[PDB]
């Protein structure tokens, strides 16, 4: 003999989708004109005894960044130039003044020639062509503009709050025991690599590593870090910039001094005491445990693809990844195609001097075996936003409620 | 538990736009890419585009990017494929699938296909 | 370049155990693949992703009699305790750059 009553004021939330807008702190790199800036006084009301149970695999707001991501992309590409003209037949030779790798090509434009990459053209059968030049429209990136990951905050808009989970034992899925109520959130960077995380946040307490339902050797295992790993990598090579006019053209003069391939090293002891951290934390959730190295597959998959200063280095990993329970020759081409599109595809116009980029290393995304062997793997840049999305929860605070209690009306 | 579904004309003549719908039901609310693939008689399969649901952001093969048009309709939840200068060459098996959400070693792979439809061209 | 090659067609009896050969350009030497089933009729499935090292990825609902092997630019399919139901078409797909590479077709038939 119950009878509903209402009772509006009561402090009820539903997870909701939403459009999140944006957050920096450059001046309007990316285009950053649509980016807010943001120096608020950041209201991280700390909830008490609330349990709402997280989730990391199924966000929307990870699709969203990446869309994000891709329309500033898009957008800061849009107004450089085509390189439509340089579809032409390319006479190479190689150059000897790791030991063919780059070709110096003559072309006739109306004849003059330039340095390509081995692995950025290919032949025609001597005569070489660009790797795709009539299948994607190549444009080649503007030189004022750089590649630097700046920091983007997501804010909810008005209605919307985003929950914070600040449990250091949480795998990102399941109950979250202590959350909070924030309105932005923490400076995400929007890095982009492969098998390596590459300056992102860092976990707390011991190692953590997470996936979708790990028993499933599908979905990708996602590993956080403690101490990051020290990663300096440089590109030895006195490049020199070299302009062609057709719309102005970019490309690589001769080489300045000797010519040696980029490589880099990593702190030996600090790598093999974080990896045996990792292979503890994977005895969980005794056998053999083994690291193999990139399974086939494409460039952008083999080899950790990373960007640096300008450069793209689509580095040798193997070395990385053979203890079972560093200097690693890092391969460069200049064409490059993003977030795995099609009839899009950039140049990347060289840099000159010698670039060095002194890095962390802070997450590895790791994929089970059948049957172990966890190679490294990757390039869905949604597995790499989610590493720093894993505590965060678009909720839309819905205040009516209903209860049953005993009462009469009228 | 994702089921697809597809639909349109059987017999189309040549030099005009061929439109199929399909629909889905048990997928994801938003994040999914919605595939369309071919395969003429006689001939293997072929990619013909894909579109993300929730940002909208299209692709299409190269050999066929200035004819083809693929759209999504969120409410109803369904999706269109448009193709325009139908020729005879263009008779096919058109199946809609969803794409992969786990680049498992360098793939995306088709986990869920229609049951395929017939469309022909003649005189 | 980059294409997909494996037999027209291959047959064998009932209850025995069939071969499918799919073959990867020079290019392709170490891609990973994917075999995919199509029953005369029906919807095709996703049987399974198949490496070079020799990993594969089981689906849910497939039976286990199906199994896969590498050898260099070389894939093969295994599959024993054969029924009316295993003749179909059968491909394997690959993904290099966003642009799709599939197999020309293998009809397999059980007598």
């Known amino acids: 003999n119950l009878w509903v009553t209402v009772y509006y004021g009561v402090p009820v939330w539903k997870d909701a989708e939403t459009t999140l807008f944006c957050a920096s702190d450059a001046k309007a790199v990316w285009a950053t004109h649509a980016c807010v800036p943001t120096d608020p006084n950041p209201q991280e009301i700390h909830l008490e005894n609330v349990t709402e149970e997280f989730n990391m695999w199924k966000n929307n707001m990870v699709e969203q960044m990446h869309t994000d991501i891709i329309s500033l992309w898009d957008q800061s590409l849009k107004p450089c130039v085509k390189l439509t003209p340089l579809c032409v037949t390319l006479q190479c030779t190689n150059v000897t003044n790791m030991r063919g790798e780059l070709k110096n090509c003559s072309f006739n434009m109306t004849k003059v020639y330039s340095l390509f990459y081995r692995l950025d053209v290919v032949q025609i059968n001597k005569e070489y062509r660009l790797i795709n030049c009539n299948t994607s429209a190549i444009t080649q990136a503007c030189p004022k503009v750089s590649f630097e990951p700046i920091p983007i905050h997501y804010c909810a808009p008005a209605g919307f709050a985003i929950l914070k989970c600040k449990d250091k034992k949480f795998n990102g899925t399941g109950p979250c025991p202590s959350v909070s109520t924030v309105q932005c959130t923490h400076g995400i960077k929007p890095v982009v690599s492969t098998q390596l995380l590459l300056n992102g946040s860092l976990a707390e307490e011991e190692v953590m590593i997470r996936s979708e339902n790990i028993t499933n050797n599908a979905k990708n295992i996602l590993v956080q870090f403690n101490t990051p790993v020290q990663i300096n990598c440089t590109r030895p090579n006195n490049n020199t910039r070299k302009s062609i006019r057709i719309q102005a053209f970019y490309a690589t003069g001769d080489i300045i001094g000797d010519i040696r391939q980029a490589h880099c090293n990593v702190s030996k002891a600090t790598w093999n005491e974080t990896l045996g951290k990792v292979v503890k934390q994977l005895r969980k959730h005794n056998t053999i445990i083994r690291f193999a190295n990139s399974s086939g597959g494409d460039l952008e998959v083999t080899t950790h693809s990373f960007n640096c200063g300008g450069e793209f280095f689509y580095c040798n990993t193997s070395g990385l990844f053979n203890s079972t329970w560093i200097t690693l020759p890092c391969r460069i081409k200049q064409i490059i195609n993003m977030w795995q599109r099609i009839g899009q595809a950039m140049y990347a116009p060289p840099i000159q001097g010698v670039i060095r980029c002194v890095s962390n290393i802070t997450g590895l995304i790791l994929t089970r075996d059948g049957g172990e062997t966890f190679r490294p793997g990757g390039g869905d840049m949604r597995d790499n936003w989610r590493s720093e999305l894993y505590k965060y929860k678009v909720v839309k605070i819905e205040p009516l409620g209903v209860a049953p209690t005993r009462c009469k009306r009228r | 538990q994702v089921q697809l579904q597809e639909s349109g004309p059987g017999l189309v003549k040549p030099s005009e736009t061929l439109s199929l719908t399909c629909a889905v039901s048990?997928?994801?609310?938003?994040?999914?890419?919605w595939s369309w693939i071919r395969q003429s008689p006689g001939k293997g399969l072929e990619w013909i585009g894909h579109?993300?649901?929730?940002?909208?952001?299209?692709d299409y093969n190269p050999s066929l990017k200035s004819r083809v048009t693929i759209s999504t309709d969120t409410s109803t939840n369904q999706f269109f494929l448009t193709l325009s200068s139908v020729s005879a060459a263009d008779t096919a098996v058109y199946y809609c699938?969803?794409?992969?959400?786990?680049?498992?070693?360098?793939?995306?792979?088709?986990?869920?296909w229609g049951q395929g439809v017939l469309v022909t061209v003649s005189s | 370049q980059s294409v997909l090659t494996q037999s027209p067609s291959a047959s064998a009896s009932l209850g025995a155990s069939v071969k499918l050969t799919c073959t990867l350009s020079?290019?392709?030497?170490?891609?990973?693949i994917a075999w995919y089933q199509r029953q005369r009729g029906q919807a095709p499935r996703f049987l399974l992703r198949?490496?070079?090292?020799?990993?594969?990825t089981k689906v849910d609902g497939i039976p286990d009699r199906f199994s896969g092997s590498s050898s260099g630019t070389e894939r093969y399919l295994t599959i024993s305790n054969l029924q009316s139901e295993d003749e179909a078409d059968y491909f394997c797909?690959?993904?290099?750059?966003?642009?799709?590479?599939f197999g020309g077709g293998t009809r397999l038939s059980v007598l």
């Open positions: 699938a969803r794409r992969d959400t786990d680049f498992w070693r360098g793939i995306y792979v088709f986990e869920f």
């Open positions: 048990g997928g994801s609310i938003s994040g999914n890419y």
């Open positions: 579109i993300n649901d929730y940002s909208g952001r299209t």
């Open positions: 020079s290019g392709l030497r170490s891609y990973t």
């Open positions: 198949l490496d070079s090292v020799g990993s594969h």
């Open positions: 797909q690959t993904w290099t750059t966003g642009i799709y590479i």
